[PDB]
Amino acid sequence: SITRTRVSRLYGLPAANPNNGKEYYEVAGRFSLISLVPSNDDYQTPIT
Amino acid sequence: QNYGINLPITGSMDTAYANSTQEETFLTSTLCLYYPTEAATEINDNSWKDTLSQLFLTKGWPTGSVYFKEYTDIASFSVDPQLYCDYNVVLMKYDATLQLDMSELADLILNEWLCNPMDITLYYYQQTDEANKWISMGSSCTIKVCPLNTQTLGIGCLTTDTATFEEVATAEKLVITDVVDGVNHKLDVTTATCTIRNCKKLGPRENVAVIQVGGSDVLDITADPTTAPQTERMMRINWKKWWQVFYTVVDYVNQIIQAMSKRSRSLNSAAFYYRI
Ligand SMILES: *[C@@H]1O[C@H](CO)[C@@H](O)[C@H](O)[C@H]1NC(C)=O
Ligand SMILES: [Ca+2]
Ligand SMILES: [Ca+2]
Ligand SMILES: [Ca+2]
Ligand SMILES: [Ca+2]
Numbered sequence: 289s290i291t292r293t294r295v296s297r298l299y300g301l302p303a304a305n306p307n308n309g310k311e312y313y314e315v316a317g318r319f320s321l322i323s324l325v326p327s328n329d330d331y332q333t334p335i336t
Numbered sequence: 337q338n339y340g341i342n343l344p345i346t347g348s349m350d351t352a353y354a355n356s357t358q359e360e361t362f363l364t365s366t367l368c369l370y371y372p373t374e375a376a377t378e379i380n381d382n383s384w385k386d387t388l389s390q391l392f393l394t395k396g397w398p399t400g401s402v403y404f405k406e407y408t409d410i411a412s413f414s415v416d417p418q419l420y421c422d423y424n425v426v427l428m429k430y431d432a433t434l435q436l437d438m439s440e441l442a443d444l445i446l447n448e449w450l451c452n453p454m455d456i457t458l459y460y461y462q463q464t465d466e467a468n469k470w471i472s473m474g475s476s477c478t479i480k481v482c483p484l485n486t487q488t489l490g491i492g493c494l495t496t497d498t499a500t501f502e503e504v505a506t507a508e509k510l511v512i513t514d515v516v517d518g519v520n521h522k523l524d525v526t527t528a529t530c531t532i533r534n535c536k537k538l539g540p541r542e543n544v545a546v547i548q549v550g551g552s553d554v555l556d557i558t559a560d561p562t563t564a565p566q567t568e569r570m571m572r573i574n575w576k577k578w579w580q581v582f583y584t585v586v587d588y589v590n591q592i593i594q595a596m597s598k599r600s601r602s603l604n605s606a607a608f609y610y611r612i
Pocket of ligand 2: 436437509510
């Protein structure tokens with residue numbers, strides 16, 4: 289809410305100060321990436 | 337007395353036969369009976385050992401010489417099968433899905449094997465002649481082989497990547513591997529839980545007989561496809577009750593021992609050839 293005004297008790301995060309002093313919002317976790325890549329399985333090399 | 341040399345022995349025809357020695361060997365020998373657990377389970381009599389001992393005594397054996405060793409099944413019994421009696425008889429239940437395992441077990445115990453250790457991590461191994469095999473036993477022995485050409489490079493496989501190796505054994509309690517002779521193979525064996533040995537088939541083991549309980553003629557104790565001999569020490573029995581099986585074994589113990597002979601490798605006269 290903004291003081292000295294009738295606009296109050298609204299839910300959300302206004303763009304005035306989303307940082308709230310905090311220098312960074314952190315979220316940690318795991319991430320799994322099933323991808324396709326270039327591997328010959330050490331099977332494209334010279335014979336010798 | 338002359339233990340290191342093979343001297344010819346000259347015998348003469350017309351030499352009178354000696355009396356029967358069956359009684360003397362029964363009195364001075366030990367008999368081991370190997371049966372599966374299901375046999376004892378079906379019999380369901382805590383005193384059946386004493387009954388069989390008394391019946392054997394009625395047949396001749398002193399009542400301290402017949403031993404009964406119990407094994408869970410063919411697969412478990414195949415791990416280091418130790419047979420120490422003068423005469424060993426193995427009742428092997430037949431399973432249509434375990435033909436190769438039964439054949440391997442019989443090959444291992446019905447024949448004498450001279451085995452040297454194997455360091456698959458150190459040497460490339462080759463089989464010299466038809467008598468040479470790779471016998472491996474353990475809780476879970478998986479064997480993969482990569483044949484190498486004259487330049488030591490693999491054939492159909494890469495020595496660096498064991499994934500390309502040709503798998504010959506998977507989760508085997510016992511396996512007798514036969515590869516092409518005169519070719520060096522890089523071996524990948526789960527040594528952590530199984531031991532592989534480079535063995536030669538010296539010849540028959542005459543003090544071990546195997547009765548296949550309720551199957552057909554399927555044992556192949558020779559890797560040669562052109563031969564599947566049925567030696568006198570491999571018998572077959574139809575069955576419904578294990579008590580009948582044991583009664584048949586007791587009643588025809590004379591014939592069963594007749595089919596067998598004292599271990600040639602054993603006894604004093606075999607000294608300084610391989611053992612005692
Ligand atoms: C062998 O058996 C015969 C006939 O039963 C008997 O006379 C003889 O004493 C036995 N023993 C020997 C050593 O010949
Ligand atoms: Ca097997
Ligand atoms: Ca391959
Ligand atoms: Ca071979
Ligand atoms: Ca064969």
